[PDB]
Amino acid sequence: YQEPTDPKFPQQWYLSGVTQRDLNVKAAWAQGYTGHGIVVSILDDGIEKNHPDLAGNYDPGASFDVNDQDPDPQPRYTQMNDNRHGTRCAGEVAAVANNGVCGVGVAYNARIGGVRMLDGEVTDAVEARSLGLNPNHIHIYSASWGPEDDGKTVDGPARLAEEAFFRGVSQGRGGLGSIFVWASGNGGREHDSCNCDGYTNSIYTLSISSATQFGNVPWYSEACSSTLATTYSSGNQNEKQIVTTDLRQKCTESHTGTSASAPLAAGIIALTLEANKNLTWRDMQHLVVQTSKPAHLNANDWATNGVGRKVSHSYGYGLLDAGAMVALAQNWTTVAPQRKCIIDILTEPKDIGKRLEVRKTVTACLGEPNHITRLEHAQARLTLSYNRRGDLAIHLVSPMGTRSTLLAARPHDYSADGFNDWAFMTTHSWDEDPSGEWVLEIENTSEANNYGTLTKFTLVLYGTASGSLVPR
Ligand SMILES: NC(=[NH2+])N/N=C/c1ccc(/C=N/NC(N)=[NH2+])cc1
Ligand SMILES: NC(=[NH2+])N/N=C/c1ccc(/C=N/NC(N)=[NH2+])cc1
Ligand SMILES: NC(=[NH2+])N/N=C/c1ccc(/C=N/NC(N)=[NH2+])cc1
Ligand SMILES: *[C@@H]1O[C@H](CO)[C@@H](O)[C@H](O)[C@H]1NC(C)=O
Ligand SMILES: [Ca+2]
Ligand SMILES: [Ca+2]
Ligand SMILES: [Ca+2]
Ligand SMILES: [Cl-]
Ligand code: NA
Ligand code: NA
Ligand code: NA
Fold it and tell me: Any idea which positions bind substrate?
């Protein structure tokens, strides 16, 4: 193997670097993994399928136009170039290599398609038809849309889209499950808290945040416990950005935001699936947890969980490491079937007032087929009223002592509508034993005399009862 000769490959610092500030993709390419045989689709504003750096890898079977209801996802050209974003993301995954044009994709021999679905009214049905496109042909989906990143919205998939996620992970990809890679949001300037976005907060999406070139949390990032890992993206004007294919058969050096991080993750996942095509949607999340790297990502909330892994709400388990992903994938043993242990916590409603703590010792379905000794995702499904939602901060502590922030204060969230069975999700207790005392903390972070009631707290544990590693 020889490294790519493309003219902008040297500018793709997050791949081509030799300073240890990269995604370690060359190490995967040198193991022989470039994405051959894998199919990725960008769910966004279309794909310029005739782009000189995409045409060679373009896959009509990975593509559709849901906005206009036809097979051709070609973007709508406008003076502002509004519909350029899906083309930028497609090239991050699978721009052609060694062809004298722009740079390369992470998985530069993968097949790449796009769904034109953001350029029109985006209904639940539009979302569902995109998520459910050709699920026995497309392996990996990449998306960065969801509720407005204004820091005051709480919303997620409606019924058709939620059904598309469950059909994808259950029957997609021959029963191994569609891999939905998702960006955690761009609401950092609005102090948004991304578990309020039900798309990234889902267990069925493999959620990704961003780091700047110098290893910092970018201005646009949202922190939340549902995030799994990180890839590089843009930062300040002294830091480089993402280099990729652009609309009108051009090359950009200024692709930005968390929406540029999810496609890079999708490309790394494509390399990993080439290394072991039998990996399930859950296997893939395990690989990410085990291989991602905190090193040189700066945050003030790095904490060690109960199995010795460092986790952050900005970064999840850290920067994706492509070489480590493909290495660990090769001999990976498929995880056991997913168990689900439902624990209804409250015996009566609880006044919140200034601060509420709910403590409960659980057996995690001891003696039952859904007994869980090895956690994957955990959810605190909460139903509560409160007079100003954004003054609330919510934490969940596992028996092993891992404090997950379920909700941070959102100063713009003035809503009086509370949370209606909202399934706040944390990845930070992955591989812990969930037996023992869990603690839920709800606090009013303002000096205001706020008021409300918690009426339901369901602790939902997912996981297995076998296969643990020694703690890190
Ligand atoms: N939770 C969230 N992820 N929210 N995302 C919000 C949002 C808002 C606008 C656009 C426009 N895209 N326009 C294009 N792609 N041409 C995309 C996403
Ligand atoms: N359940 C939900 N809240 N789904 N939200 C989906 C969603 C939200 C905003 C946009 C904006 N697009 N803006 C543009 N294309 N200029 C697209 C999709
Ligand atoms: N903004 C929103 N409207 N969000 N709504 C979300 C949401 C999600 C799933 C379902 C499933 N319903 N399944 C049934 N009724 N059998 C219903 C609503
Ligand atoms: C895929 O994994 C399943 C579950 O472990 C196993 O039964 C099957 O033989 C595997 N298939 C291949 C081709 O490795
Ligand atoms: Ca079309
Ligand atoms: Ca190229
Ligand atoms: Ca958000
Ligand atoms: Cl479920
Ligand atoms: Na997710
Ligand atoms: Na700890
Ligand atoms: Na315990």
Answer: 45, 82-83, 127, 144-149, 155, 183-186, 197, 199, 259
The neighbourhood of ligand 10, an ion, using CB within 5 A, equals: 304, 401
Among 278, 280, 330, residue to substitute to test ligand 4 (most atoms within 8 Å of Cβ): 278
Rounded Cα–Cα distance for residues 146 and 25 (Å):
29
Taking Cα atoms as reference points, which of 463, 427, 461, 434 lies closest to residue 344?
461
CATH 2.60.120.260 domain residues, the chain:
339-464
Q: What is the resolution of this structure in A?
A: 1.8
Q: How many CB atoms lie within 10 A of CB 296?
A: 12
Measured CA to CA in angstroms, residue 253 lies from 49, 272, 289 at distances of 20, 26, 30
Q: Which ligand is nearest to the CA of 243?
A: 6
458 token code pair:
């369901």
- Active-site annotation holds for 59: no
At the second CATH level, the architecture of 9-330 is 3-Layer(aba) Sandwich (3.40)
Structure determination method: X-ray
